[PDB]
Subunit: 297 residues, 6 copies
Amino acid sequence: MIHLYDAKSFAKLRAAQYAAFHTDAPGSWFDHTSGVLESVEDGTPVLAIGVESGDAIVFDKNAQRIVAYKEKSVKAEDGSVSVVQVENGFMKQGHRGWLVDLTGELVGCSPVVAEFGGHRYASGMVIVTGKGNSGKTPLVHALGEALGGKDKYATVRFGEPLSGYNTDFNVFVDDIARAMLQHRVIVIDSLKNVIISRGAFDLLSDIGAMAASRGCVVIASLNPIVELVKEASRSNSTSLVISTDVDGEWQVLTRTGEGLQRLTHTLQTSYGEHSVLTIHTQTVIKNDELESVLRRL
Amino acid sequence: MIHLYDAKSFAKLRAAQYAAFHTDAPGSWFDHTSGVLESVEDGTPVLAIGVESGDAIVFDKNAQRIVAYKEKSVKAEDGSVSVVQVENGFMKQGHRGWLVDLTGELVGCSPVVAEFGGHRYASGMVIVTGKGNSGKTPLVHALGEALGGKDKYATVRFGEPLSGYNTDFNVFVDDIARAMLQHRVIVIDSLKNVIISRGAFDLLSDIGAMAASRGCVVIASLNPIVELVKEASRSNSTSLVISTDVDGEWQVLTRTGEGLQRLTHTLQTSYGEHSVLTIHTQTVIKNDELESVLRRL
Amino acid sequence: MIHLYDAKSFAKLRAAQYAAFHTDAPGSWFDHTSGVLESVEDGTPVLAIGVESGDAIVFDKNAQRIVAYKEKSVKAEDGSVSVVQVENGFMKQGHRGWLVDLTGELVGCSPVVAEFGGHRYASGMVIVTGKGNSGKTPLVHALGEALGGKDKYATVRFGEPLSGYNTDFNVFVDDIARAMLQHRVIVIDSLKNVIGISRGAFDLLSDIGAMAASRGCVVIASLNPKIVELVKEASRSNSTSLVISTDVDGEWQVLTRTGEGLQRLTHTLQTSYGEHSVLTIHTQTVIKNDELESVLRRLT
Amino acid sequence: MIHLYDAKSFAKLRAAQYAAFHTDAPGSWFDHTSGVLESVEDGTPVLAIGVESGDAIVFDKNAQRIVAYKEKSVKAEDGSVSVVQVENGFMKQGHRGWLVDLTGELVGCSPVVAEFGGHRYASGMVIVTGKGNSGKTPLVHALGEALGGKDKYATVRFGEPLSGYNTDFNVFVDDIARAMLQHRVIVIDSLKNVIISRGAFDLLSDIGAMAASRGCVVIASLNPIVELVKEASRSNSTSLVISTDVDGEWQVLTRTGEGLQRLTHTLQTSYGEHSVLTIHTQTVIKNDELESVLRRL
Amino acid sequence: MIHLYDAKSFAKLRAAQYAAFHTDAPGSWFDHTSGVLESVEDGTPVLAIGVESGDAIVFDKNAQRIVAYKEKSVKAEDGSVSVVQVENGFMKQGHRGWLVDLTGELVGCSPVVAEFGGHRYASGMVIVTGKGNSGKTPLVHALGEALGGKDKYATVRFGEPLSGYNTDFNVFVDDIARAMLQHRVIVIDSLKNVIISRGAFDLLSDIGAMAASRGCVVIASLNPIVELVKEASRSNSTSLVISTDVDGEWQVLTRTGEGLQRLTHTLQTSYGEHSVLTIHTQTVIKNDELESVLRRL
Amino acid sequence: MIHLYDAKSFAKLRAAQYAAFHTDAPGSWFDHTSGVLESVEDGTPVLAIGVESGDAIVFDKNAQRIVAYKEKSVKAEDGSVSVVQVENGFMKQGHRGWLVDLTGELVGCSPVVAEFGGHRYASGMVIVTGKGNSGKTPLVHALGEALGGKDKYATVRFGEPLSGYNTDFNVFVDDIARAMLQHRVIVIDSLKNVIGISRGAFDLLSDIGAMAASRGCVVIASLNPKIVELVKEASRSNSTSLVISTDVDGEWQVLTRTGEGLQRLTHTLQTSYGEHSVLTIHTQTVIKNDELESVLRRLT
Ligand SMILES: O=c1ccn([C@@H]2O[C@H](COP(=O)(O)OP(=O)(O)OP(=O)(O)O)[C@@H](O)[C@H]2O)c(=O)[nH]1
Ligand SMILES: O=c1ccn([C@@H]2O[C@H](COP(=O)(O)OP(=O)(O)OP(=O)(O)O)[C@@H](O)[C@H]2O)c(=O)[nH]1
Ligand SMILES: O=c1ccn([C@@H]2O[C@H](COP(=O)(O)OP(=O)(O)OP(=O)(O)O)[C@@H](O)[C@H]2O)c(=O)[nH]1
Ligand SMILES: O=c1ccn([C@@H]2O[C@H](COP(=O)(O)OP(=O)(O)OP(=O)(O)O)[C@@H](O)[C@H]2O)c(=O)[nH]1
Ligand SMILES: O=c1ccn([C@@H]2O[C@H](COP(=O)(O)OP(=O)(O)OP(=O)(O)O)[C@@H](O)[C@H]2O)c(=O)[nH]1
Ligand SMILES: O=c1ccn([C@@H]2O[C@H](COP(=O)(O)OP(=O)(O)OP(=O)(O)O)[C@@H](O)[C@H]2O)c(=O)[nH]1
């Protein structure tokens, strides 16, 4: 919805956004939105996501697809009306994204998803990319385990020429929807085949906001069309993890919230048995330095 | 409609257009059009805006969407007939833009929306853009608060990978329509995802004229496809706010009206707590200097 | 229709075309076609113009849109049949352009629309363009007033981010149709969004010059310069005349196609601003194709 | 249809093709095909031509459009079956081009259309083009009158911003069809707007063969997308008339028949009153010289 | 169908493929497939070819088009089922190409079509192309007569601005189908207008295999979009005849079979009366030399 | 489906993936999936593959096409529901790929298909490509025979101008589906016309590697190099292994993805021709991403 501000309410918002990353208990936002989803009446649509054609499929709180849902309208606080209708397995009225309010007035956050190695990590979409010899697949799994912490991480597999990999985009969005509905830490391997269908364009534009609203992190590998990789990394990701000149070393660049500073830190990594990667255990980065990082792609 | 002029009536028009920016009380036009909208008979369509497909949705004076409206014709002063019909939630007959006359003979104005720091600002669309380290999001919010003055400004959020951000274009145009119907100062963060669908093309072509007719200002962030950013900044904006070589410094370029001089002034800014930006408190700019400014993108 | 010529009838045509620009009373063609339109029986379609989709809408002599019109055929002199039918507000049979004969055998003219400052100006479409600091909007209004003379000029506004500007293409073509049906001197500000492409926009660029020249009205259209080459081609091939800014501030070059197969003429305009940016225009030489291309190169 | 040859029948064909340009009385082929068309039973389709959409409209021998025609099949000499059906003003079955046989075994000719100034000119399509100051419109009319000889030439006007010019492609193809059905010498001013719709592509590919089969000449002005002008001039024209370095001077390049030599000669011209051009009163040209000529465009 | 091999059966296949070009009596394959076609039961579809739209038309053994054919299934040796159905003059079920088995296990051949001047020539598609002054049209007719030998060659004419030339693609594919059904040596003048519709793409991809399966040769002129000419010449042709630096001289490059060596030889030619060309009466060429030849286009 | 991991279960997966290439008996995965397919109830859809239009056709375990199949749902372990429905010969509900579970928890493998000349070879798709004089067609047949071992290899022929070659894409996908359903070693000659693009062709390039790796069969496809970059990306991202010609005639480099997140391995092949162009292949080192890109650069 739209929000109105004066100087005082705006300052309060920025303080709350800052807290949502810097001082909230890691993973608190995820637990909060889990409660909101759990409170939703049975059969109510909670999430719509685009399929390959640009139509949208709709899910309930238990990640079960809704095939039929009678037109139903809800008036928001700002006066806007949201309508939802599902017919023959597809959204007839509504919008892509969360169909229930997970955020309220607290918008524009990068809710802290986890803390690891003395660094806080944001929810939203994290694109893992770069050139050179440092492998992306081992990194995304290492990050998934690390941010998972006490919890297991969920793996969505797509579009690689290996056993058991789904290559159908419509199954992919079903997997992603279920993952975000049920898990705080999600790995996607890989985004190569989405990088173009209306569904693929929708996914790139929608997923970061979907994840940040939920308070889950989606860690997606993307091997570098090159300008679309750059723009997805620049504008569609909440955080970026990019390989450097030095083997095993990665740079993490985090958007900490709406209008807030982008932060950076470095990761050192090494391989153990069967290529299992281990990540070893604040500085601001400006826009010109950010573009300098993107040039390496 | 079409308008006829001789030398004397043309000179009168230019004098009135000049006054609409330079000497009218700031925000007076907005208050005038609010009165016009308030005088509209119950149920009457007042605004049509394009959705993603290129179809148009229609709103009444209270920013409520009209789903059904029997064909109704109105003869204008020049002899032209405007017809409006709405069926199944979509415009069947009519045009995009204001469906009631807010302007009359007084067309081609950039009605003054506010005065701040000794400078007058125009209604219409203001694109906030540029390269370098000066942040666009903090600027648009600072400008929104400043031009809001005694009034709160409205924030429309779109297409960023942060919590609570809508990423569905059809919700976006609903938000924008409501904002322009109800508020003098509007911030859009951001225009990145519109920059292509018929709806997106319609919005870029329509919004400046819609806002200027209302006397509201739409302050839109746009991070630089590059030629589309240049043309939107060159030809679709009433004013442009562009970052400079010096950190914190911005140049404001204002179209003051039809056939009138483009003016320029500079803004100095600084950050306080939680990245809240403060803007610190006539010279003509020619077309070649304007192009020189656009080259920096 | 098609026309047949031998040496003698061709020479006569060229003499008549030459006269239509050089010696006819300025604005005489417009008055003639006004009479033709006024003589048309009530309810008869006179003009069809393309909307955004590429369908065509149809107008009667009073610039009122025709919604329903039973199929009706007319056999021309060359043996061809023109059919007109309108159903549900759209042309079902017919063609874009004038649906009644305004011209007869006298085709390929640039009928003189006005004389100002010792120069004759052609009807048809005039594109006002160029680079540099000389403003196009003040020029089109100055030219509109000047060629209007004793008469007011009509202003069609389209696609600028200013108060009261229509930005819907289908309203735009309605405005243009009405303007050409009712006025000799017409200003369009601006053509930017038509060049910004729909079938309707393509139709308009291809149709408007011939429509205006047939009527004997002048359409003075501002156009600020893939896209640049379309501005060049519209200026090169879709305009009856071109007014282009020069190196010197306030100075413009007017390039006029005087008729079918006839010489393109050129002259210069000097201008200055008064109060509230009102521009005043201050008061024969042939230009060849290579010089014409040299002028178009400046649009880069 | 398909034709079978051995050495002896092939040599006979080449001799007949050579004669069709070099020794037949100028305009004889046109008179022959006029007789063939005149012999066609009343109401029979004789010519189909593409409209803008790529559908085809159909004409009888009197250049009257056929709106309804019951399916009718004709078996050719080679065993092939040609079917023709027209429904609701459009071809339902058939092909673009001549729907009756004007040529028989005598195919691949450039039938002589006229002789002027000691040079024979071919029927088919003649593209008049080039750069520089020599005007194309005066040339096409001068050539039309000259090749017309004792007969008037027909003028088809299209796509110029001058009084009485048709700009609707579907009227254009109607004009062209009627012209070719009724006249030996035809001028088109101009081909600029065809140079893209399916109809325009069809016309460029069809018109030369249509005209050569009839024995009429279509003299078309084409101002130079540039590569499409080159290919139309190279491959879609029976003859080319191109301006040179010297003002008033033109080069005529003629395909004299299937597998036969391309010939060249020069024209000198001058203007009289009201820009009426007068043309003042064998050498082979090879493919490399032909390409050299096309480079000048 | 699919075929299974071990070392011994593979070696046998390669020996048979080698023989099909090098040692079989010239034209023997054509006579064999004529027998196969003649043995087909009355009314049975034997050949399907794509029309402009990408639909397919269907022919019987007598080159008569089939308009209606009830669904009929045939189980192949590998277990696959081929179904054929024709409705309203178009293929409803089936595939493009030969609808009866002309080859059996003997696949991947370039069956010898003729011997002339001490050189064997392959069936399939021969593209005649190149730059320079050597004419393609006279060459294709000279080659047609020469390879025809005791038999007349068939000429398919398409897309040139000369008398009697068909320019409608759907008539073109009808001509080609009939030619391949009834004649061993076929000339196409020319392929310029096919070089894009689905039908044109189908034809370029299908014709070589169609011709090689039949044992007929299709000799097609193609004047050089340039990369499409290169790829058609590189990958869609069984043999290539390309002009050289020396006037009248041509290089013939022949694919002799699946996985077999490409051979080359040179032709010398001269003109007699009315431009009738006479061709005057083993060395391997590698891929790098082949690309060197293609660069000349 | 989605899979959940902690450190311990992830380490177990990587160990199992490593084993699936390095230590499992060659061809064991193929035999396992043959058993799974054989156990499927009569009439059950097992494989869906895209036709030219982007619709999908569906096959049973005997490689017979299914024309009609009533909607049928199956709930997976992760909670997801897979639905399959076939109407009028086309998939109405379902997904492209294997419609029965051949893999279970054991995903992301490159199951060893064969061992030859002291080297293990992966199932999945192998693209055979490169520039220079070394012929691709003889190589794919030599590799087919070699990896076939005791078994014959299947040859799918497509899009070459030679006798008996199918050139219809929909027949091609039928051939490929049958081949993967019935044979461990498959040769495709050639992929040129799929790269020559339809939705079906795009689907095939994106689907075939995963289909083959899931089955444990190897698809050995020749591909001769806008278009060049698509050959590079297909070779880079759509292939389980790559066999590319080198500077030296007869010599090839084999680059193998050994599994999800595992090392890419490389070795060289020497070859020579016998009679009638029959090629014979004569009888671990890791390759990094920068070296891999260096190899791909040679395709220009
Ligand atoms: O022990 C190992 C294993 C793997 N790797 C390296 O990590 C990579 C992980 O395996 P991938 O094949 O997934 O590579 P990637 O994610 O970097 O890029 P794509 O191929 O998916 O586009 C492998 O390509 C390998 O080079 C190591 O450096 N050490
Ligand atoms: O205290 C602060 C906070 C923020 N900033 C700067 O302001 C920017 C505002 O945050 P954004 O991430 O919105 O940057 P932006 O609007 O310029 O561009 P997008 O990424 O949205 O396209 C941040 O990127 C940061 O560099 C400061 O300079 N100081
Ligand atoms: O007094 C004046 C007023 C205006 N001008 C100049 O005339 C121009 C007329 O006003 P516009 O803003 O319309 O500029 P334009 O027509 O040249 O081009 P667009 O922006 O419409 O594409 C303005 O851009 C201004 O620079 C003057 O030179 N002096
Ligand atoms: O007496 C004359 C008349 C005309 N001309 C020249 O002949 C041309 C014929 O008039 P056009 O305007 O038709 O020029 P064109 O055919 O060469 O090219 P387009 O403008 O149609 O694209 C004119 O443009 C003029 O330059 C002369 O050289 N002498
Ligand atoms: O006696 C002759 C006749 C013809 N020729 C040459 O042979 C060519 C055959 O006539 P074409 O015009 O068909 O040339 P082409 O096939 O090479 O190319 P297209 O224009 O058809 O695309 C002619 O262009 C001519 O140059 C001779 O060298 N000597
Ligand atoms: O004995 C032989 C036979 C064949 N070859 C070489 O092997 C190649 C195999 O025959 P192909 O003609 O199939 O070549 P290719 O597979 O390399 O590429 P495409 O043409 O299919 O795109 C032939 O091109 C030939 O040069 C030899 O080097 N020696």
